[PDB]
Symmetry: D2
Subunit: 460 residues, 4 copies
Amino acid sequence: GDSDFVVVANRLPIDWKRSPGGLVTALEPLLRRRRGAWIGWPGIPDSDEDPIVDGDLVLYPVRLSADDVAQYYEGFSNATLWPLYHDVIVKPIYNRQWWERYVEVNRRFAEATSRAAARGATVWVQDYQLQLVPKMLRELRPDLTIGFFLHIPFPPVELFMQLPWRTEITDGLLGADLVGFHLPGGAQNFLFLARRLVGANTSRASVGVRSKFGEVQIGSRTVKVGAFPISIDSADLDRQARQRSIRQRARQIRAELGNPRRILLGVDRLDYTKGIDVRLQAFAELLAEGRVNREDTVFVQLATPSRERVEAYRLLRDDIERQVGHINGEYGEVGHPVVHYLHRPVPREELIAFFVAADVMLVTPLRDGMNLVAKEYVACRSDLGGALVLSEFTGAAAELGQAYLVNPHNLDHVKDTMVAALNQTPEEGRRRMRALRRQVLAHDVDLWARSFLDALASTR
Amino acid sequence: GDSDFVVVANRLPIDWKRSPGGLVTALEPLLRRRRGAWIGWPGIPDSDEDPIVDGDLVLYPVRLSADDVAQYYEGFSNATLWPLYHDVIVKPIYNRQWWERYVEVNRRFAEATSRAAARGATVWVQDYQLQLVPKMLRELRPDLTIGFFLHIPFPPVELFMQLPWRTEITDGLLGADLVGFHLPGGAQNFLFLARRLVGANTSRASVGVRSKFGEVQIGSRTVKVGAFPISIDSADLDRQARQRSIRQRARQIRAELGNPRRILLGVDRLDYTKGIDVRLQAFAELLAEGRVNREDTVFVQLATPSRERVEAYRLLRDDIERQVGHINGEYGEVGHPVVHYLHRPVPREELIAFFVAADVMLVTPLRDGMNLVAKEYVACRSDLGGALVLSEFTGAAAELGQAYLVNPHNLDHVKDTMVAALNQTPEEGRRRMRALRRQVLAHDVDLWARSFLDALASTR
Amino acid sequence: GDSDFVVVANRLPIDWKRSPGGLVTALEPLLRRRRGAWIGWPGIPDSDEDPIVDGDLVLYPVRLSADDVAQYYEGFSNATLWPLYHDVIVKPIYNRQWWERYVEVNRRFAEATSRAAARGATVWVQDYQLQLVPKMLRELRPDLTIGFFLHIPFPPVELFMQLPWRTEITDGLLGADLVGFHLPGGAQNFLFLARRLVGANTSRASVGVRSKFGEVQIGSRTVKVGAFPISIDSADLDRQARQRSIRQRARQIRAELGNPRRILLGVDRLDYTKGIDVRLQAFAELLAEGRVNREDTVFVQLATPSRERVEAYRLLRDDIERQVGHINGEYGEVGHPVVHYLHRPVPREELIAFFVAADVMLVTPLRDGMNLVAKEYVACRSDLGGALVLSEFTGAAAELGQAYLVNPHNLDHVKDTMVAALNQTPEEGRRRMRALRRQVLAHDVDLWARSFLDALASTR
Amino acid sequence: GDSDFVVVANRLPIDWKRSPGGLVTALEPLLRRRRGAWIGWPGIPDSDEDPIVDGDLVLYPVRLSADDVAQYYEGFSNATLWPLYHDVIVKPIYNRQWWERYVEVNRRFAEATSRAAARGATVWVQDYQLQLVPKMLRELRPDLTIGFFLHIPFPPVELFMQLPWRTEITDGLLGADLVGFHLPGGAQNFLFLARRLVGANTSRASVGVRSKFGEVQIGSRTVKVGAFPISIDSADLDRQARQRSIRQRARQIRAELGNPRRILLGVDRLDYTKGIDVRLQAFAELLAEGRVNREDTVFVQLATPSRERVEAYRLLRDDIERQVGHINGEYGEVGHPVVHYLHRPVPREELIAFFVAADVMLVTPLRDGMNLVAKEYVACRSDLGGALVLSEFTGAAAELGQAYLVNPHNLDHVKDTMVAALNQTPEEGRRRMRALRRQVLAHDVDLWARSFLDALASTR
Ligand SMILES: O=P(O)(O)OC[C@H]1O[C@H](O[C@H]2O[C@H](CO)[C@@H](O)[C@H](O)[C@H]2O)[C@H](O)[C@@H](O)[C@@H]1O
Ligand SMILES: O=P(O)(O)OC[C@H]1O[C@H](O[C@H]2O[C@H](CO)[C@@H](O)[C@H](O)[C@H]2O)[C@H](O)[C@@H](O)[C@@H]1O
Ligand SMILES: O=P(O)(O)OC[C@H]1O[C@H](O[C@H]2O[C@H](CO)[C@@H](O)[C@H](O)[C@H]2O)[C@H](O)[C@@H](O)[C@@H]1O
Ligand SMILES: O=P(O)(O)OC[C@H]1O[C@H](O[C@H]2O[C@H](CO)[C@@H](O)[C@H](O)[C@H]2O)[C@H](O)[C@@H](O)[C@@H]1O
């Protein structure tokens, strides 16, 4: 093809209209200097595969049938790999037909990439749905420079080894010149896996942050291994949260809640990895114990619907919704719930207004690759108000140490911490938020993307 | 003893202070002409059995241990008889130890009654927990005139026959001179049961309302069988609902709900017989179909906690609470649920204010002996506003035919009917409420009690 | 058409080859004197509707699609009517699409019948899947004489009234000149239903067995209502069970079981109405209590697979299979289970050999229209050996009073009774079996069929 | 005290009579040269703590109440630590009261040890119930040399970190001079944990088998870390399996099973870690596919009852027992199951006879510290017959590579492997069994115990 920089991801960066923010916006000044392409599925079943010139980008759509989506995406990706890589919170399903479709779809992505990529081009493959693509691509196109970044956690070897296709996934990733993870921990698991399962020679030292890279020796070539913690466009969110309409909506939100003294907020895709049940349990017990005032404190949980065709998620929804009904029936009043729960997509401007209104942000995943909601909250609070309660089991906890960190399995401490955040002095709240903002403003998605691409370019 | 009129019920009519309204108040002008006694359990485990002179009444407390309560009341009564007599909505548990404790406790009630009752006294035994007492009492005291009234439904023979102790329960009831039920249907089941199981000769004709009594021949004596539909102190509730404080609270309730155009109301003890799940299902589907306006219509469900030590009820609570959380997550807004659910006791004055505020009363039991909430709502609406949606499977439906009657199993028609009630013209609403009030004002608890006692006195 | 006697049933009497025994064989000498037809579904989806001359009979196949089977048969029949008519052991599903398909299929059966039936012909409609056909047929063909026989129980009114389409089903049955049930109890429920729901005038007396018929007045015509308890071809089974090959197989069965002293046997379609779980519970507890000898006593349960596409049945299968595994793990030995359980169809000659081998026949339904397995066992034991343990909640219990009758809900007595049957003296066993055989040999399927047809002919 | 060598374990080595084999027998020639003591709970609630001189040993009983057992053993040990350390197959319960009792009981063991231990004595603490004892003991008695061996797996850090008391457990283990695990993998997890959680300086190299030890620097002292894979008294089992009575019982077992051509055998404590469900699933599917002959092949599963008061285990038992009943109902014949399942303790001589009779040993844990059943089978087959199917997720798989190794999550390969083992040539079977026996005969419990004690003595 005629593109010298190519991104490969499960989805095209569109909604059709181009998706705002995220990866595609981080790369904007690189596309202004390269002939760029994006390979992905357009998000609707059985489409054409004809290239679309989106001015700054050429889009190469990948055709997936409804059956492909069911077995490669909802199946192998969402119901085999996802629960396994997140510490088997739910039991992975090992299904051979799903594996076979995952292989076929990965090959299709690899072929689309080759079609788009010029000779010697740089290719950046994204995330867990496409772990076979680097090896497949190198076999098709040995001229290419290939990076891979995993956006979800990489599990310990004891769990990874469960996968019947463990060796094929590992060989898949080793097809890259650069394999990156958010955290040194994932990088180190990958190195150990390479030694244990593949018998490759690797470096033994700890892996640094955006530095002190590891290496895997594969025949004549070396695979670089690194940690690059993703972030957001901090400055842009900071600006957006100051808009008059956002601030007026935040005020209106508080009015509609009957002007509570304190608002706790949860914002997540409805997923068992997100620890929404832990928040509700802690809040319920604090109310029972009279440690939170049911008359002036309210918890808002915004759950975005997710993976409805996957049975585990329907069961999760049932459990969360029971907790909500239960807590309100026990501690609410007619015309005044203590928990407001919404199960629907939320426009970004509405989410930002909730960040601005929220006195306590509850981000309590059982396991999460990074979690950008934590960083978005921080970027929105230029008033230095608010408080972030953050699970240690997120990538974000490695950078946001000034937050109120919790082990979500330690319910006693989660409860103590919610009380502490709710009752913090203004000065202490400001001190923490000021320190968190310094980190998030300085370590943004631009720093992340440049660091990964510099590392990848270094493999030439 | 020295009492010529004796009431026997599972509980004493106290809360200690005397319980307002109900049976004990209906009998007030009879106690002004008799030496009256009340036999029952004081509602707290392991108490004395020393008589208490409550001026108008002598109270004879029955001692029950916590173990007695568990096996006779929570066990045999609430988990064997209750589900069986209500068309096995839940599977009855047949437990021999529970039966044996039920026999022992019934004997204890019979002995207390004999202690209190003077020679030739009239005795009125209440309800399903004490079905053995009439026979036990007649054996101890053949001089007594004994009436029994069942407040819950009497099931068809095909279901009743499941009971391993079917014959003992039947012989128990046949110890009375008069056996009464709310409805001719229950009376007719009893007659058929007497023929089928006991082989007694009975009358064959239909049983009337407060008339055309049936009879069972038992050796030399005849048992009278009748239908006496219970009611309320209609005039008293009518007066109470007009008080300024009630009306001001009803207005405040509507304000606290954000001034909806329409309020649907459910008021029940949390029980699987009450069809609360049907209301929530119908309401959810109407919202899905856009047939109810989620912006100006709200459903308030007040569930009084019940039988928490009985497993079936904990499961029911879980199911209802899931539905509540689900419906609000799908159709609510932050600061504005479509369903307000409270699981706690409610003071009577607060309940009356909710009756006055409610545009639609939802009384949809799967099976109910009478249901007095339906009649209380009617008595409270002297403004002739509101609408009553009423299950056919209540005793009340036999008298309140002007209500919007529903088969709760016919969900399509339950939904059609809720829409009809919500959108009725003012005139049509008034016509129905006027007719319902004529019935309820004329057929009150005084008429009921006098009719039963006249019938009983007739057996002398 | 050209047939003066027409049978209408859900299935054609074939397997293709003609089905042995049953109804079709009982009618053999009537078909030798009439021009007979049989209307039914050939048991395979989407077939022709072309008549088949089977010599003694003309077969009129009814076309049903797989979707028809799912919604009319597996749906409305097996998952609405079946659980409702059997005392809601499982919760009926009320589904409007199922009802609509049930109506359409019933109309199709009615149209096929009209096509086959000559002028003034006699029509005999069978069982609960076709309850609308008599009214539909009378509207199409007022010249026809129409009988209907219900082979399953007719439930009490309190349960029947749940059905949203209660009135349509009732009007459906009232289209017949004769409505028959196994038992007077079902007939009496039907009479009461007719008065309560339809407001028709009926007879009030008890209904006799094959006599003392009830009546329902419907405008100008009278519907006859009777009880006709079905039976088997007793003499034929008696002969078959004496064959040398049967007796040798029975001996071999005992040898293969390691020559136990006592064999208990259960034979049923796998259905929640059959009380298989009760047998296993009783047997397990008797073993725990040391009241049955685990070294010389064995229980064989032959469950024929049934209704696999209906969820309730998959759950039932799971529960039964757990009990089997549990009891063997607790009381068996390697090479020697105490329970042998087979989930597969069994050839009739093999079933007869099991009847001959079995010391105790366990027929313990929670609710059953008649149950012919009980009568078949009796007819097979011309040696006068064996023992029949029989639930009171079967139609058979009304005729087989000499059996060991049990209330399956009374587990203590079920256990006492199994011990009694296992340890009965030879003489007492013979006395009971002799009396049971006198009843079953004299009251066979020929007597049943002639009694119903005589009653029907009487309506002309 | 007056003992210079002290063993500390949850249970005393008794049954009272001294327990045969195991640890206590491995140490017999050391006790012949030392003044030895054993500290443990005598296995019955609320006992004395008075020392018992068992000739070769002094026994120091630890008093545990029934409540102690419930919260320290059944609670924290069996329902927190056990599932966590075995890759959270079941969700651990994090309970603070359980933790507090675990601390108190561990202190009680530490105090008993100090009472028994002479100055400068060597102490060997066993297994996961007593992980706090080394630190507690060092604080009480800094003069002691302390070893700890973990008999179950040590989980990856990502899972271990869930524990609210992660730091206290880690500090607990670091109180030892020597910490040992079966496998280098566990040792390496421990080293990484020490760096990540405690911030201690550790060695970075791979850990060897009984060599190349790791180290953790704790202030002035160094903790040695090693891998010592446990084994059995191979020679003793080899002799015992040759006894005439054992061989005659093995023959009788095959006769009682109706002389099958092939017997598969499972022997385990009933635990969710043991993968019994996987064996049954594979066997069921092989029968469905006609790849195993249901007429000449039989599977015997001997499950020893375990942890009945722990809810997870009652659920597991239910699931296994359903599978057993299901497979026999589908593929068995009357008098001939394909699966024989026994849930009861089995005498050791009977177990050995089953090892000798079994053509295929199925040892398929999802996760297991070592699993000695695999090695016992090998030691019993001096005839070189049989075949061992072994999960990779056992410690045993690191030494028994000549077995048929399986990933139990790869059901297709488990099935292929069972077929391969069942149909192996005599010569190939012998080749594998010969190689397995060479390993197991040379690497016995004596080698294991001496290696650990040599390492520990080296820390002086
Ligand atoms: O559901 P799919 O389409 O498979 O996507 C998974 C998940 O991907 C992103 O989350 C992950 O990446 C971000 C950014 O690196 C991390 O912050 C998260 O911790 C990862 O889980 C999306 O943000 C998610 O919406 C999406 O579900
Ligand atoms: O829970 P227990 O103490 O056993 O009491 C049952 C029930 O008794 C009353 O309800 C019944 O009687 C009334 C009056 O006749 C009828 O309207 C109901 O339909 C019957 O169920 C009480 O009102 C209930 O609170 C109580 O639960
Ligand atoms: O499953 P379907 O096809 O709907 O048939 C139901 C049932 O019909 C028969 O049983 C019923 O009739 C007999 C004879 O009158 C009675 O003895 C039973 O008690 C009734 O249930 C068949 O025998 C059954 O196999 C069939 O399932
Ligand atoms: O149930 P508890 O009393 O807590 O004991 C657990 C377990 O201990 C032993 O098994 C473990 O150690 C052996 C020997 O090292 C290993 O082979 C196993 O893999 C470990 O699980 C006993 O053998 C078990 O009976 C016991 O349950």
